[PDB]
Amino acid sequence: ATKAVCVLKGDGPVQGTIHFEAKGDTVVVTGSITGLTEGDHGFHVHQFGDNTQGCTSAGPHFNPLSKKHGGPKDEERHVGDLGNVTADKNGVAIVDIVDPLISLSGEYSIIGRTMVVHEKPDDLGRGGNEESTKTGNAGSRLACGVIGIAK
Amino acid sequence: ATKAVCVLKGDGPVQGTIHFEAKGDTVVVTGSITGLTEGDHGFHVHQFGDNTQGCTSAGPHFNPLSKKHGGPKDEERHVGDLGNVTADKNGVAIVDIVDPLISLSGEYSIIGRTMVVHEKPDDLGRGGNEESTKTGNAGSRLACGVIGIAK
Ligand SMILES: [Cu+2]
Ligand SMILES: [Cu+2]
Ligand SMILES: [Zn+2]
Ligand SMILES: [Zn+2]
Numbered sequence: 001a002t003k004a005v006c007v008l009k010g011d012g013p014v015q016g017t018i019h020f021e022a023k024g025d026t027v028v029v030t031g032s033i034t035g036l037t038e039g040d041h042g043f044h045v046h047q048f049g050d051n052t053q054g055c056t057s058a059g060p061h062f063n064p065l066s067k068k069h070g071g072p073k074d075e076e077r078h079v080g081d082l083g084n085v086t087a088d089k090n091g092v093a094i095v096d097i098v099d100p101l102i103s104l105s106g107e108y109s110i111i112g113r114t115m116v117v118h119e120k121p122d123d124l125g126r127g128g129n130e131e132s133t134k135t136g137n138a139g140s141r142l143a144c145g146v147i148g149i150a151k
Numbered sequence: 152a153t154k155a156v157c158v159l160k161g162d163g164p165v166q167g168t169i170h171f172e173a174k175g176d177t178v179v180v181t182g183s184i185t186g187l188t189e190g191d192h193g194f195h196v197h198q199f200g201d202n203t204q205g206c207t208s209a210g211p212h213f214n215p216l217s218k219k220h221g222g223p224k225d226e227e228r229h230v231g232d233l234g235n236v237t238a239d240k241n242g243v244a245i246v247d248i249v250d251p252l253i254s255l256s257g258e259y260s261i262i263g264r265t266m267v268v269h270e271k272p273d274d275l276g277r278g279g280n281e282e283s284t285k286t287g288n289a290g291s292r293l294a295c296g297v298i299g300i301a302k
Contacts, residue, residue: 004200049298146263148201
């Protein structure tokens, strides 16, 4: 598949629609998320597309290469590490990401997995603690959705 | 992936959790759906895992071999044609399906696609009108969910 989509939903006011398109050896991620507190929010692909227990059942950050957490620009990062999305004063974040590691096909495809937007900013593994190199201290999962094949 | 899961949600009271497991050379579908009217309800894999416009954006039945609609035991059927689930008087349908056309990896993969449960019975393509050859006259989509990779 060359296109994918994900509708984010949660137990709070946060919602959004994320679009994915394969371009060359990258995936262009677009869309928007609303209902967020002003500022940065961690944005990652989690391993399982399992919504049986809210966003908790999505598991850890997608990490097929068994690396530590990092920012999208780092060599040492989880495949699912897409950094931060930024919400304005009105709580709207416009997603504009081009990533070379996530894919929509092959062993490390994100189709069927989960997109999660977090409570706090992702410190990109530069927080000086063991949680920084695991989750980026992004906090709780505000909303998530299973990534599906799009027309 | 050898296991998948799908959480069904809609605008009404219908909900459910569907499990998929690759066993041997086939796929075993289990789970349950609640809030249904007593009797049969069409149950199919739809093409897109797109929930941007509710269950409508899931598109038509998954049909990579370009066939007409049928029952799961028919040669002429859509890959997504899993027939009917049956709800008891309490509105509970126990899903128990083994299917030879769907898969969880490759050309026939339903990962990233959508499961839909319908308002009415699926006539298995034998209704006699054009609609039967497309949807089995199963009618509206009561609940649906994107099929994700499970642990
Ligand atoms: Cu995350
Ligand atoms: Cu259907
Ligand atoms: Zn990570
Ligand atoms: Zn069909």
